[PDB]
Amino acid sequence: MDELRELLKAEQQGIKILKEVLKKAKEGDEQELARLNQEIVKAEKQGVKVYKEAAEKARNPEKRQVIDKILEDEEKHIEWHKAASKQGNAEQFASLVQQHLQDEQRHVEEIEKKN
Ligand SMILES: [Zn+2]
Ligand SMILES: [Zn+2]
């Protein structure tokens, strides 16, 4: 097969982390927040690596569209967090995490329907 389970797991991993970070944002530690941001970027970056591989292994261009779309969006997310790695505020950081969460949920929503 073309493999989808790890692809799903990657998005799930980020969602788990995002929910985790949102909690920890209330914990309110600078070192933790930096760690959390790095955790997110690392997962997203790896996801792009896997999705790129999957994109080439995409059987249908129709299915590739979905993957290719996500490929850009996860890179897009990394771009946002790269900015956060420069400067950011606590409230904004929590908001970024929650907004990112919504994006990933769409991806899972889109991917889970195997048709
Ligand atoms: Zn993402
Ligand atoms: Zn995603």
Instruction: Give the ligand with the smallest distance to the CA of 107.
Output: 2
Instruction: Give the ligand with the smallest distance to the CA of 45.
Output: 1
3-state secondary structure 36-91: HHHHHHHHHHHHHHHHHHHHHCCCCHHHHHHHHHHHHHHHHHHHHHHHHCCCCCHH
Instruction: Give the ligand with the smallest distance to the CA of 79.
Output: 1
Alpha-carbon gap, residue 61 to 56, rounded angstroms: 10
CA 60 to centroid of ligand 1, rounded, Å: 23
CA dihedral 54, 59, 61, 64 (to 10 degrees): -20
21 CB-contact burial (10 Å; exposed 0-12 / middle 13-18 / buried 19+)? buried
CB 72 within 8 A of CB 48: no
97's enclosing H/E stretch is: helix 90-112
CA 72 to centroid of ligand 1, rounded, Å: 9
Question: CB-hemisphere CA count at 13 Å for 28?
Answer: 2
**Residue 107 lies in domain:** 1-115
Alpha-carbon gap, residue 41 to 100, rounded angstroms: 11
Alpha-carbon gap, residue 41 to 35, rounded angstroms: 10
CA 89 to centroid of ligand 2, rounded, Å: 24
Tokens encoding 39 = 């955790």
Instruction: Give the ligand with the smallest distance to the CA of 75.
Output: 1
CA 59 to centroid of ligand 1, rounded, Å: 23
CA 31 to centroid of ligand 2, rounded, Å: 25
How many domains does the chain divide into? Answer: 1
CATH number at residue 105: 1.20.120.660
**Approach to solving:** NMR
Instruction: Give the ligand with the smallest distance to the CA of 100.
Output: 1
Burial 50-70 (b: 16+ CB within 10 A, else e): bbeebbeebeeeeebebbbeb
